[PDB]
Amino acid sequence: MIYVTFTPYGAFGVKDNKEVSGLEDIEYKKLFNEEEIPDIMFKLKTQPNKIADELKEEWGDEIKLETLSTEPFNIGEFLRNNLFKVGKELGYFNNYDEFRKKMHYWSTELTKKVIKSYA
Ligand code: NA
């Protein structure tokens, strides 16, 4: 059973909700290229079960998404508290100003898609 959290820049999984200190403790990593980030934020938001079946195929195990759980996962707490630092380590953000500007753009693009979804 793989427990998965998504950030804007990736999907990250660990078997059996194990504790996570660092990226070395993360067993499954799918990184997203920046041009698809908002599209994938919107698909997570509107068809999470489809996202889950896709990961089940790609990673080879049943999948629990954190967005479909009432209790946060160890992996989710780690990524939320280290969202900038892990994204810098992965090459998405060179500094905090960039992180801020990128997160803003992605969120704005996601909103645009959500507004459109409402006719
Ligand atoms: Na560890």
Side-chain angles (χ1 to χ4, degrees), residues 1-34 37-53 55-56 58-70 72-76 78-99 102-115 117-119:
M1 175 68 83
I2 299 173
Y3 282 69
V4 182
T5 293
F6 268 72
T7 67
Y9 51 75
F12 297 94
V14 66
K15 281 277 179 60
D16 295 333
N17 194 24
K18 293 198 303 298
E19 216 95 37
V20 171
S21 25
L23 269 170
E24 63 268 8
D25 291 331
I26 303 184
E27 303 159 351
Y28 293 94
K29 298 185 181 96
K30 190 176 190 189
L31 296 195
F32 306 143
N33 306 319
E34 321 234 58
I37 285 178
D39 276 358
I40 300 167
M41 293 164 80
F42 178 77
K43 188 166 150 175
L44 207 228
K45 183 182 297 303
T46 52
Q47 15 196 224
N49 291 307
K50 186 165 70 76
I51 293 289
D53 287 352
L55 291 174
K56 184 187 154 178
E58 179 171 11
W59 293 351
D61 201 356
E62 283 298 303
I63 296 286
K64 255 183 80 59
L65 284 50
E66 200 186 32
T67 45
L68 298 173
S69 173
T70 36
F73 297 164
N74 292 317
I75 192 156
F78 173 64
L79 283 165
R80 282 183 289 277
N81 299 336
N82 301 279
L83 183 65
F84 164 64
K85 166 189 163 178
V86 169
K88 174 173 175 46
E89 265 156 16
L90 304 170
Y92 286 87
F93 312 130
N94 231 8
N95 52 57
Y96 200 80
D97 182 40
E98 191 176 26
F99 166 73
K102 281 191 186 181
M103 291 287 288
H104 194 81
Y105 181 72
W106 292 336
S107 287
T108 296
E109 289 299 301
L110 172 59
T111 292
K112 271 159 68 172
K113 291 172 189 302
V114 174
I115 288 183
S117 83
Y118 292 119

Short mmCIF file of all heavy atoms in Angstrom, two decimals, residues 16-75, unseen atoms left out:
data_model
loop_
_atom_site.label_atom_id
_atom_site.label_comp_id
_atom_site.label_asym_id
_atom_site.label_seq_id
_atom_site.Cartn_x
_atom_site.Cartn_y
_atom_site.Cartn_z
N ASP A 16 3.41 2.08 3.29
CA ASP A 16 2.99 1.89 4.66
C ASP A 16 3.18 3.14 5.55
O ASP A 16 3.47 3.04 6.73
CB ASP A 16 3.76 0.67 5.25
CG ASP A 16 3.37 -0.63 4.54
OD1 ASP A 16 2.25 -0.76 4.01
OD2 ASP A 16 4.21 -1.51 4.47
N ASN A 17 3.01 4.31 4.95
CA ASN A 17 3.01 5.54 5.74
C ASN A 17 4.24 5.64 6.61
O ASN A 17 4.22 6.19 7.73
CB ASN A 17 1.73 5.64 6.58
CG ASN A 17 1.52 7.03 7.15
OD1 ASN A 17 2.02 8.07 6.62
ND2 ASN A 17 0.85 7.10 8.27
N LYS A 18 5.41 5.15 6.11
CA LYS A 18 6.59 5.24 6.96
C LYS A 18 7.04 6.73 7.22
O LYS A 18 6.64 7.66 6.47
CB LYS A 18 7.72 4.40 6.28
CG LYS A 18 7.32 2.89 6.32
CD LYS A 18 8.46 1.94 6.09
CE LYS A 18 9.18 2.17 4.80
NZ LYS A 18 8.26 1.97 3.72
N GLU A 19 7.84 6.93 8.26
CA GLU A 19 8.29 8.26 8.54
C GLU A 19 9.20 8.72 7.46
O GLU A 19 9.80 7.96 6.83
CB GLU A 19 9.02 8.35 9.88
CG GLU A 19 8.74 9.67 10.60
CD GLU A 19 7.60 9.64 11.64
OE1 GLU A 19 7.40 8.66 12.36
OE2 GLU A 19 6.90 10.64 11.78
N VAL A 20 9.23 10.01 7.29
CA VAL A 20 10.01 10.65 6.18
C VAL A 20 10.77 11.84 6.77
O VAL A 20 10.08 12.78 7.26
CB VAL A 20 9.07 11.10 5.01
CG1 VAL A 20 9.80 11.94 3.97
CG2 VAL A 20 8.46 9.88 4.26
N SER A 21 12.13 11.85 6.63
CA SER A 21 13.08 12.84 7.19
C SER A 21 13.61 13.66 5.94
O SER A 21 13.96 14.88 5.98
CB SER A 21 14.18 12.13 8.10
OG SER A 21 14.63 10.66 7.97
N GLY A 22 13.53 13.01 4.78
CA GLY A 22 14.36 13.47 3.64
C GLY A 22 13.95 12.74 2.39
O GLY A 22 13.16 11.79 2.45
N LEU A 23 14.60 13.02 1.27
CA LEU A 23 14.06 12.52 0.00
C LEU A 23 14.54 11.10 -0.05
O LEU A 23 14.00 10.25 -0.76
CB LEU A 23 14.62 13.36 -1.20
CG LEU A 23 13.84 14.57 -1.65
CD1 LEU A 23 14.65 15.42 -2.65
CD2 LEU A 23 12.63 14.11 -2.48
N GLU A 24 15.58 10.76 0.77
CA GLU A 24 16.09 9.41 0.80
C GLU A 24 15.06 8.42 1.37
O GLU A 24 15.15 7.20 1.20
CB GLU A 24 17.37 9.25 1.67
CG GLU A 24 17.21 9.56 3.16
CD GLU A 24 17.51 11.03 3.52
OE1 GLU A 24 17.68 11.84 2.59
OE2 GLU A 24 17.56 11.39 4.74
N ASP A 25 14.12 8.98 2.13
CA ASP A 25 13.05 8.09 2.72
C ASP A 25 11.79 7.94 1.83
O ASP A 25 10.84 7.25 2.15
CB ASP A 25 12.55 8.74 4.01
CG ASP A 25 13.60 8.73 5.12
OD1 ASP A 25 14.44 7.81 5.11
OD2 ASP A 25 13.59 9.67 5.94
N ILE A 26 11.81 8.63 0.71
CA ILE A 26 10.70 8.64 -0.25
C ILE A 26 11.00 7.61 -1.32
O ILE A 26 11.98 7.72 -2.08
CB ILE A 26 10.40 10.06 -0.83
CG1 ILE A 26 10.10 11.04 0.39
CG2 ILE A 26 9.32 10.00 -1.90
CD1 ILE A 26 9.71 12.43 -0.09
N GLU A 27 10.18 6.59 -1.41
CA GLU A 27 10.39 5.49 -2.32
C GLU A 27 9.88 5.70 -3.75
O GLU A 27 10.39 5.15 -4.67
CB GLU A 27 9.77 4.23 -1.76
CG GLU A 27 10.31 3.88 -0.44
CD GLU A 27 9.42 2.97 0.39
OE1 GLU A 27 8.30 2.70 0.04
OE2 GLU A 27 9.89 2.55 1.44
N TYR A 28 8.86 6.51 -3.92
CA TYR A 28 8.27 6.73 -5.26
C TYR A 28 8.22 8.15 -5.51
O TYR A 28 7.64 8.93 -4.71
CB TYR A 28 6.81 6.25 -5.21
CG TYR A 28 6.80 4.77 -5.02
CD1 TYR A 28 6.70 4.25 -3.72
CD2 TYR A 28 6.96 3.90 -6.08
CE1 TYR A 28 6.75 2.86 -3.49
CE2 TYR A 28 6.95 2.48 -5.86
CZ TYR A 28 6.84 1.99 -4.59
OH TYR A 28 6.87 0.61 -4.37
N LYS A 29 8.82 8.63 -6.66
CA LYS A 29 8.79 10.07 -6.95
C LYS A 29 8.40 10.28 -8.41
O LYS A 29 9.08 9.79 -9.28
CB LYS A 29 10.26 10.61 -6.86
CG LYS A 29 10.80 10.41 -5.42
CD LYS A 29 12.17 11.04 -5.30
CE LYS A 29 12.68 10.80 -3.90
NZ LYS A 29 13.59 9.59 -3.76
N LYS A 30 7.36 11.05 -8.61
CA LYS A 30 7.03 11.46 -9.99
C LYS A 30 7.11 12.96 -10.02
O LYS A 30 6.33 13.64 -9.40
CB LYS A 30 5.64 10.96 -10.29
CG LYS A 30 5.34 11.16 -11.80
CD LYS A 30 4.00 10.57 -12.10
CE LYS A 30 3.79 10.51 -13.61
NZ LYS A 30 2.36 10.12 -13.83
N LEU A 31 8.02 13.53 -10.81
CA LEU A 31 8.17 14.92 -10.84
C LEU A 31 7.36 15.48 -12.05
O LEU A 31 7.07 14.72 -13.05
CB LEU A 31 9.69 15.17 -10.98
CG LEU A 31 10.56 14.71 -9.82
CD1 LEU A 31 11.91 15.45 -10.11
CD2 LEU A 31 10.01 15.16 -8.49
N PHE A 32 6.89 16.72 -12.00
CA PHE A 32 6.09 17.19 -13.09
C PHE A 32 6.86 18.28 -13.81
O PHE A 32 7.65 19.01 -13.22
CB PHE A 32 4.79 17.79 -12.55
CG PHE A 32 4.00 16.88 -11.64
CD1 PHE A 32 3.34 17.43 -10.54
CD2 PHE A 32 3.83 15.51 -11.95
CE1 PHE A 32 2.53 16.60 -9.67
CE2 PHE A 32 3.08 14.65 -11.08
CZ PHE A 32 2.43 15.21 -9.98
N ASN A 33 6.77 18.30 -15.13
CA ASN A 33 7.40 19.42 -15.77
C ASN A 33 6.56 20.63 -15.62
O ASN A 33 5.35 20.54 -15.60
CB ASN A 33 7.70 19.05 -17.24
CG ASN A 33 8.52 17.72 -17.27
OD1 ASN A 33 9.46 17.50 -16.43
ND2 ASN A 33 8.05 16.78 -18.04
N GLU A 34 7.17 21.78 -15.56
CA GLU A 34 6.47 22.95 -15.12
C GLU A 34 5.29 23.33 -15.96
O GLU A 34 4.35 23.85 -15.45
CB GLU A 34 7.40 24.13 -14.89
CG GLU A 34 8.70 23.84 -14.30
CD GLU A 34 9.00 24.65 -13.06
OE1 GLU A 34 8.19 24.53 -12.14
OE2 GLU A 34 10.00 25.36 -12.97
N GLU A 35 5.31 23.07 -17.25
CA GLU A 35 4.20 23.50 -18.10
C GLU A 35 2.90 22.70 -17.83
O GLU A 35 1.79 23.18 -18.08
CB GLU A 35 4.64 23.37 -19.58
N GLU A 36 3.03 21.50 -17.26
CA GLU A 36 1.84 20.69 -16.93
C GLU A 36 1.38 20.87 -15.51
O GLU A 36 0.37 20.25 -15.14
CB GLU A 36 2.13 19.21 -17.08
N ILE A 37 2.10 21.62 -14.71
CA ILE A 37 1.75 21.72 -13.26
C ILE A 37 0.29 22.11 -12.97
O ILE A 37 -0.43 21.42 -12.20
CB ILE A 37 2.80 22.52 -12.48
CG1 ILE A 37 4.08 21.66 -12.27
CG2 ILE A 37 2.25 22.91 -11.19
CD1 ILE A 37 5.23 22.39 -11.54
N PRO A 38 -0.20 23.19 -13.59
CA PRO A 38 -1.58 23.57 -13.28
C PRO A 38 -2.61 22.53 -13.71
O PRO A 38 -3.60 22.29 -13.01
CB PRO A 38 -1.77 24.86 -14.13
CG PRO A 38 -0.43 25.49 -14.15
CD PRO A 38 0.50 24.26 -14.36
N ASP A 39 -2.40 21.93 -14.89
CA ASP A 39 -3.27 20.87 -15.42
C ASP A 39 -3.34 19.75 -14.42
O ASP A 39 -4.39 19.22 -14.14
CB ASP A 39 -2.63 20.27 -16.68
CG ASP A 39 -2.94 21.06 -17.95
OD1 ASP A 39 -3.68 22.07 -17.92
OD2 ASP A 39 -2.42 20.61 -18.98
N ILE A 40 -2.19 19.39 -13.84
CA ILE A 40 -2.20 18.24 -12.88
C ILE A 40 -2.80 18.66 -11.57
O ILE A 40 -3.53 17.83 -10.91
CB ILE A 40 -0.78 17.65 -12.72
CG1 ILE A 40 -0.23 17.12 -14.04
CG2 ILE A 40 -0.69 16.56 -11.53
CD1 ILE A 40 1.27 16.86 -13.85
N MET A 41 -2.55 19.89 -11.12
CA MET A 41 -3.30 20.41 -9.92
C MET A 41 -4.79 20.33 -10.14
O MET A 41 -5.56 19.93 -9.23
CB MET A 41 -2.92 21.86 -9.57
CG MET A 41 -1.43 21.98 -9.08
SD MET A 41 -0.94 23.73 -9.15
CE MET A 41 -1.65 24.43 -7.67
N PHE A 42 -5.24 20.62 -11.36
CA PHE A 42 -6.70 20.65 -11.58
C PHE A 42 -7.26 19.21 -11.63
O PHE A 42 -8.34 18.93 -11.13
CB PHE A 42 -6.98 21.37 -12.87
CG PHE A 42 -8.42 21.41 -13.24
CD1 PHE A 42 -9.31 22.27 -12.62
CD2 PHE A 42 -8.87 20.62 -14.28
CE1 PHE A 42 -10.65 22.33 -13.00
CE2 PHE A 42 -10.22 20.67 -14.67
CZ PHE A 42 -11.10 21.54 -14.03
N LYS A 43 -6.53 18.31 -12.25
CA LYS A 43 -6.95 16.88 -12.31
C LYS A 43 -6.98 16.23 -10.89
O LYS A 43 -7.85 15.44 -10.59
CB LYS A 43 -5.99 16.11 -13.19
CG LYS A 43 -6.43 14.68 -13.47
CD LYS A 43 -5.64 14.03 -14.63
CE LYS A 43 -5.50 12.48 -14.45
NZ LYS A 43 -4.84 11.73 -15.59
N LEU A 44 -6.07 16.61 -10.01
CA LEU A 44 -6.06 16.11 -8.65
C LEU A 44 -7.28 16.59 -7.94
O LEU A 44 -7.89 15.89 -7.22
CB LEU A 44 -4.85 16.61 -7.91
CG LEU A 44 -4.25 15.84 -6.75
CD1 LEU A 44 -3.99 16.69 -5.60
CD2 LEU A 44 -4.87 14.59 -6.39
N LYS A 45 -7.58 17.85 -8.16
CA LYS A 45 -8.73 18.50 -7.56
C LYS A 45 -10.07 17.95 -8.04
O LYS A 45 -11.01 17.89 -7.25
CB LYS A 45 -8.66 20.03 -7.68
CG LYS A 45 -9.76 20.77 -7.02
CD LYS A 45 -9.63 22.27 -7.24
CE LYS A 45 -8.35 22.77 -6.59
NZ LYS A 45 -8.30 22.45 -5.14
N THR A 46 -10.16 17.48 -9.29
CA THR A 46 -11.47 17.08 -9.83
C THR A 46 -11.68 15.60 -10.08
O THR A 46 -12.81 15.12 -9.96
CB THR A 46 -11.78 17.90 -11.12
OG1 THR A 46 -10.66 17.78 -12.00
CG2 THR A 46 -11.83 19.33 -10.77
N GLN A 47 -10.60 14.86 -10.41
CA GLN A 47 -10.61 13.39 -10.56
C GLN A 47 -9.53 12.66 -9.81
O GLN A 47 -8.72 11.94 -10.42
CB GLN A 47 -10.49 12.96 -11.98
CG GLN A 47 -10.02 14.05 -12.80
CD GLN A 47 -10.27 13.73 -14.25
OE1 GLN A 47 -9.41 13.94 -15.11
NE2 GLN A 47 -11.44 13.13 -14.52
N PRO A 48 -9.56 12.78 -8.49
CA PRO A 48 -8.48 12.13 -7.74
C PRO A 48 -8.52 10.57 -7.93
O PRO A 48 -7.47 9.94 -7.88
CB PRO A 48 -8.69 12.60 -6.29
CG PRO A 48 -10.21 12.95 -6.26
CD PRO A 48 -10.56 13.42 -7.62
N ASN A 49 -9.70 9.94 -8.07
CA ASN A 49 -9.72 8.49 -8.18
C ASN A 49 -9.02 8.07 -9.49
O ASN A 49 -8.37 7.04 -9.56
CB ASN A 49 -11.16 8.02 -8.14
CG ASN A 49 -11.80 8.20 -6.77
OD1 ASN A 49 -11.25 7.76 -5.74
ND2 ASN A 49 -12.94 8.87 -6.73
N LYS A 50 -9.16 8.86 -10.54
CA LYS A 50 -8.44 8.57 -11.80
C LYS A 50 -6.88 8.67 -11.64
O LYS A 50 -6.10 7.77 -12.05
CB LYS A 50 -8.95 9.54 -12.86
CG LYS A 50 -8.36 9.24 -14.26
CD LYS A 50 -9.15 9.95 -15.35
CE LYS A 50 -8.90 11.43 -15.29
NZ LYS A 50 -7.59 11.96 -15.82
N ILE A 51 -6.46 9.74 -10.98
CA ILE A 51 -5.05 9.90 -10.52
C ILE A 51 -4.56 8.70 -9.76
O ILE A 51 -3.53 8.16 -10.09
CB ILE A 51 -4.83 11.13 -9.62
CG1 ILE A 51 -5.02 12.43 -10.39
CG2 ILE A 51 -3.37 11.04 -8.95
CD1 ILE A 51 -3.92 12.58 -11.31
N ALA A 52 -5.31 8.26 -8.76
CA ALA A 52 -4.96 7.07 -8.03
C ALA A 52 -4.86 5.79 -8.88
O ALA A 52 -3.94 5.02 -8.64
CB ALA A 52 -5.99 6.82 -6.93
N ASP A 53 -5.74 5.57 -9.87
CA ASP A 53 -5.69 4.32 -10.66
C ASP A 53 -4.45 4.40 -11.53
O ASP A 53 -3.78 3.39 -11.78
CB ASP A 53 -6.91 4.17 -11.61
CG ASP A 53 -8.19 3.84 -10.92
OD1 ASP A 53 -8.21 3.56 -9.72
OD2 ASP A 53 -9.23 3.80 -11.64
N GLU A 54 -4.15 5.59 -12.04
CA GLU A 54 -2.94 5.79 -12.86
C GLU A 54 -1.65 5.50 -12.10
O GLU A 54 -0.68 4.93 -12.65
CB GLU A 54 -2.86 7.25 -13.29
N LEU A 55 -1.60 5.92 -10.83
CA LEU A 55 -0.41 5.67 -10.04
C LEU A 55 -0.37 4.24 -9.69
O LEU A 55 0.68 3.67 -9.51
CB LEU A 55 -0.36 6.59 -8.79
CG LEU A 55 -0.13 8.07 -9.04
CD1 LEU A 55 -0.24 8.96 -7.75
CD2 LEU A 55 1.14 8.26 -9.83
N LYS A 56 -1.53 3.60 -9.52
CA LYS A 56 -1.53 2.18 -9.13
C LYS A 56 -0.84 1.42 -10.26
O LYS A 56 0.00 0.55 -10.02
CB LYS A 56 -2.99 1.67 -8.92
CG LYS A 56 -3.02 0.25 -8.44
CD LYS A 56 -4.42 -0.40 -8.36
CE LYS A 56 -4.27 -1.94 -8.50
NZ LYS A 56 -5.57 -2.67 -8.39
N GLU A 57 -1.15 1.80 -11.50
CA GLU A 57 -0.50 1.16 -12.67
C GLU A 57 0.95 1.46 -12.76
O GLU A 57 1.74 0.57 -13.05
CB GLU A 57 -1.18 1.50 -14.02
N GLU A 58 1.33 2.70 -12.56
CA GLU A 58 2.69 3.09 -12.77
C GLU A 58 3.64 2.64 -11.69
O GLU A 58 4.75 2.32 -11.95
CB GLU A 58 2.71 4.59 -12.94
CG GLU A 58 4.01 5.22 -13.16
CD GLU A 58 3.87 6.69 -13.54
OE1 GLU A 58 2.78 7.25 -13.42
OE2 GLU A 58 4.89 7.29 -13.92
N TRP A 59 3.21 2.64 -10.45
CA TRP A 59 4.04 2.22 -9.35
C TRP A 59 3.89 0.82 -8.88
O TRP A 59 4.74 0.34 -8.15
CB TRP A 59 3.82 3.17 -8.16
CG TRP A 59 4.36 4.64 -8.43
CD1 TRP A 59 5.11 5.07 -9.51
CD2 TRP A 59 4.09 5.83 -7.65
NE1 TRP A 59 5.34 6.44 -9.41
CE2 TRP A 59 4.78 6.91 -8.26
CE3 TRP A 59 3.43 6.06 -6.45
CZ2 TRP A 59 4.80 8.18 -7.71
CZ3 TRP A 59 3.44 7.34 -5.93
CH2 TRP A 59 4.11 8.40 -6.56
N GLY A 60 2.76 0.19 -9.22
CA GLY A 60 2.64 -1.26 -9.06
C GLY A 60 2.10 -1.69 -7.70
O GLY A 60 2.43 -2.74 -7.20
N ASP A 61 1.22 -0.88 -7.14
CA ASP A 61 0.65 -1.15 -5.83
C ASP A 61 -0.59 -0.34 -5.60
O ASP A 61 -0.85 0.62 -6.30
CB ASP A 61 1.71 -0.93 -4.74
CG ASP A 61 1.40 -1.67 -3.40
OD1 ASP A 61 0.29 -2.30 -3.29
OD2 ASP A 61 2.24 -1.53 -2.43
N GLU A 62 -1.46 -0.79 -4.67
CA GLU A 62 -2.61 0.00 -4.25
C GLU A 62 -2.10 1.34 -3.73
O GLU A 62 -0.96 1.40 -3.21
CB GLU A 62 -3.35 -0.74 -3.11
CG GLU A 62 -4.21 -1.92 -3.61
CD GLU A 62 -5.32 -1.48 -4.56
OE1 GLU A 62 -6.18 -0.62 -4.19
OE2 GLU A 62 -5.35 -2.04 -5.69
N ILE A 63 -2.93 2.37 -3.80
CA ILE A 63 -2.52 3.74 -3.57
C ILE A 63 -3.51 4.38 -2.60
O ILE A 63 -4.73 4.19 -2.74
CB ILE A 63 -2.66 4.54 -4.90
CG1 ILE A 63 -1.72 3.99 -5.94
CG2 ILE A 63 -2.50 6.06 -4.70
CD1 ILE A 63 -0.30 4.34 -5.71
N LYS A 64 -3.01 5.02 -1.55
CA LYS A 64 -3.83 5.88 -0.73
C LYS A 64 -3.44 7.36 -1.00
O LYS A 64 -2.32 7.72 -0.68
CB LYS A 64 -3.67 5.52 0.73
CG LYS A 64 -4.91 4.75 1.30
CD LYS A 64 -4.79 4.43 2.81
CE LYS A 64 -5.12 5.62 3.69
NZ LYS A 64 -6.49 6.24 3.58
N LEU A 65 -4.30 8.21 -1.57
CA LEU A 65 -3.97 9.65 -1.63
C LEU A 65 -4.33 10.39 -0.40
O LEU A 65 -5.41 10.21 0.17
CB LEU A 65 -4.74 10.38 -2.80
CG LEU A 65 -4.27 10.16 -4.20
CD1 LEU A 65 -4.22 8.73 -4.20
CD2 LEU A 65 -5.40 10.66 -5.12
N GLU A 66 -3.42 11.26 0.02
CA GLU A 66 -3.65 12.10 1.14
C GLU A 66 -4.82 13.02 1.04
O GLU A 66 -5.49 13.28 2.10
CB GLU A 66 -2.42 12.90 1.53
CG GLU A 66 -2.48 13.42 2.97
CD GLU A 66 -1.29 14.32 3.26
OE1 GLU A 66 -0.79 15.02 2.30
OE2 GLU A 66 -0.83 14.29 4.42
N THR A 67 -5.15 13.47 -0.17
CA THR A 67 -6.35 14.27 -0.38
C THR A 67 -7.60 13.45 -0.17
O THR A 67 -8.63 14.03 0.05
CB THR A 67 -6.47 14.91 -1.77
OG1 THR A 67 -6.15 13.96 -2.74
CG2 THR A 67 -5.56 16.05 -1.91
N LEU A 68 -7.52 12.13 -0.24
CA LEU A 68 -8.71 11.37 0.07
C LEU A 68 -8.64 10.75 1.47
O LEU A 68 -9.30 9.74 1.72
CB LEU A 68 -8.93 10.29 -0.97
CG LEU A 68 -9.14 10.87 -2.35
CD1 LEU A 68 -9.17 9.77 -3.40
CD2 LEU A 68 -10.37 11.69 -2.42
N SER A 69 -7.86 11.34 2.35
CA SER A 69 -7.73 10.81 3.76
C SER A 69 -8.12 11.87 4.74
O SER A 69 -7.76 13.05 4.53
CB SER A 69 -6.22 10.55 4.06
OG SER A 69 -6.00 10.21 5.43
N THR A 70 -8.72 11.51 5.88
CA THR A 70 -8.99 12.51 6.90
C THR A 70 -7.86 12.82 7.82
O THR A 70 -7.95 13.74 8.57
CB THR A 70 -10.10 12.12 7.83
OG1 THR A 70 -10.05 10.73 8.05
CG2 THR A 70 -11.41 12.47 7.23
N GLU A 71 -6.81 12.02 7.78
CA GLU A 71 -5.69 12.22 8.67
C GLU A 71 -4.48 12.39 7.75
O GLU A 71 -4.44 11.73 6.71
CB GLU A 71 -5.45 11.00 9.56
N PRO A 72 -3.59 13.28 8.12
CA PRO A 72 -2.43 13.59 7.27
C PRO A 72 -1.45 12.40 7.38
O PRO A 72 -1.45 11.66 8.39
CB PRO A 72 -1.84 14.83 7.95
CG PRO A 72 -2.40 14.75 9.39
CD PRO A 72 -3.74 14.22 9.24
N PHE A 73 -0.64 12.22 6.34
CA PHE A 73 0.37 11.16 6.31
C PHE A 73 1.70 11.76 6.78
O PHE A 73 1.97 12.97 6.61
CB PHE A 73 0.55 10.68 4.84
CG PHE A 73 -0.68 10.06 4.22
CD1 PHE A 73 -0.77 9.88 2.83
CD2 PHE A 73 -1.74 9.65 5.01
CE1 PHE A 73 -1.88 9.25 2.27
CE2 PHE A 73 -2.91 9.01 4.45
CZ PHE A 73 -2.99 8.86 3.10
N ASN A 74 2.64 10.93 7.24
CA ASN A 74 4.01 11.42 7.57
C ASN A 74 4.66 12.11 6.38
O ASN A 74 5.31 13.17 6.52
CB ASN A 74 4.83 10.28 8.03
CG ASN A 74 4.30 9.78 9.40
OD1 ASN A 74 3.98 10.61 10.29
ND2 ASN A 74 4.03 8.46 9.51
N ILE A 75 4.52 11.52 5.21
CA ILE A 75 5.03 12.12 3.99
C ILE A 75 4.45 13.49 3.64
O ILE A 75 5.13 14.28 3.14
CB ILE A 75 4.92 11.17 2.79
CG1 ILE A 75 5.72 11.67 1.60
CG2 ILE A 75 3.47 10.89 2.42
CD1 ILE A 75 6.05 10.65 0.76
#
